[PDB]
Amino acid sequence: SLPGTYRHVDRTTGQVLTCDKCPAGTYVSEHCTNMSLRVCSSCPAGTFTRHENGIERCHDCSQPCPWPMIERLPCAALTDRECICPPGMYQSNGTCAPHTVCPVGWGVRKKGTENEDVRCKQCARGTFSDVPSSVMKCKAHTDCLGQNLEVVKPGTKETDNVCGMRLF
């Protein structure tokens, strides 16, 4: 039972044996017997074992990455291949979906990842987004006074302050 062991019933003698586990990257090619320790063999190409184990066959690797996913992790003796969505997309259902574009009047509020869509928010008062973008955040209105000009047209969610000079 103890966690480095597994239980195995000798297929001829019927005896209940306590065998030692094999390392990850390996599987049991020969169970222990009355006289002998279990024998381990390396996972063949296209299979893997992630953990210490007492199993008779390595796990088949996942299918190769379906377009447009890319492989960050190859199939190897200790690892399943790992497929992820290319930049600017995220895992949706079983495929890749483009990141949500935050339109004019909106800016990124939570950045987009390979597992999670972009989250957008309405630019707050005093800021604006004049571009649809899945990465740009909201930008503060140009300070017109700060460069010795007047606000000739107040900014909105969608538009910057318009600076200018006026005569009277």
Ligand X SMILES: *[C@@H]1O[C@H](CO)[C@@H](O)[C@H](O)[C@H]1NC(C)=O
Closest to Mg ion by CB, 74 vs 126, is 126
Q: What is the chain's Cα-based Rg? A: 30
12 touching ligand X, by CB under 6 A: no
93 touching ligand X, by CB under 6 A: no
Return left, alpha or beta for 152; rule: phi > 0 is left, psi -120 to 50 is alpha, else beta. alpha
Structural tokens at position 36:
């002998």
Q: Using CB under 5 A, which of 26, 49, 53, 129 touches Mg ion?
A: 129
Count of residues near other proteins by CB under 8 A: 13
Structural tokens at position 116:
């999670």
**Footprint of Mg ion on 64-123 (CB under 5 A):** 102, 106
CA angle 23–16–34, rounded 5-degree value: 75
16 touching ligand X, by CB under 6 A: no
Q: Using CB under 6 A, which of 1, 12, 14, 35 touches ligand X?
A: 35
Strands of 43-105, DSSP E = 47-48, 59-60, 70-73, 82-84, 89-92, 95-98
Task: Give the CA distances from residue 135 to residues 89, 93, 106, 111, 121, in Å, rounded to whole numbers and listed in that order.
Answer: 12, 23, 11, 7, 12
Q: To the nearest whole angstrom, how small is the minimum distance from the Cβ of residue 33 to ligand X?
A: 8
For residue 129, the partner it binds in Mg ion, ligand X, other proteins, none, with Cβ less than 5 to 8 A by kind, is Mg ion
Q: To the nearest whole angstrom, how small is the minimum distance from the Cβ of residue 48 to other proteins?
A: 11
147 touching ligand X, by CB under 6 A: no
Asked whether 21 and 31 are in contact (CB, 8 A), the reply is: no
Q: Using CB under 8 A, which of 7, 110, 125, 153 touches other proteins?
A: 110
**Chain positions contacting other proteins, by CB under 8 A:** 4, 20, 23-26, 36-37, 40, 42, 52, 78, 110
**Chain positions contacting ligand X, by CB under 6 A:** 34-35
